[PDB]
């Protein structure tokens, strides 16, 4: 016939604090988790770049978790520029319009919400491969 039992076990699943805020884990990365205020970036309009999957999803969280604005587009509104591997546009906005946006990686954004308070972005430059 029929007939079993079931028994306790520990597996790991999301649901609390899940992952160190860490881009290494940024698609496994609790935003719910920074403490920080829910005007971090207020009135702190950010260009997401690179990005598409999860980590994206997040900045997305983040950004508006922290009041930012996350512009669809870019433009000499833009106060930030977060890239996660490449920004092209940049290259065409630089074109159009003359500003310099702060170019940092999510990683930034992530301190930022992870200490509670923005950054310095030198630490956190996005620069192209080689050196000299």
Known sequence: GSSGS????????????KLEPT???LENLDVSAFQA???????????????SGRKLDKL????????GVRFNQLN???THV?????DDELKQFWNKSAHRPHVVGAKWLL???????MLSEEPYIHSGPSSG
Do not use: A, H, M, Q
């Open 60 to 67: 997305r969280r983040l950004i508006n978790s922290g009041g």
């Open 23 to 25: 881009l290494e884990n």
């Open 6 to 17: 079931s028994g306790s076990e520990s597996i790991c699943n999301s649901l609390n604090s």
């Open 76 to 78: 000499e509104d833009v």
């Open 111 to 117: 301190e930022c919400f992870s200490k509670g308070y």
């Open 37 to 51: 205020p829910e005007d971090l970036l207020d009135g702190c309009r950010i260009y997401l770049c690179g990005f």
């Open 82 to 86: 977060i890239v996660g591997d490449y």
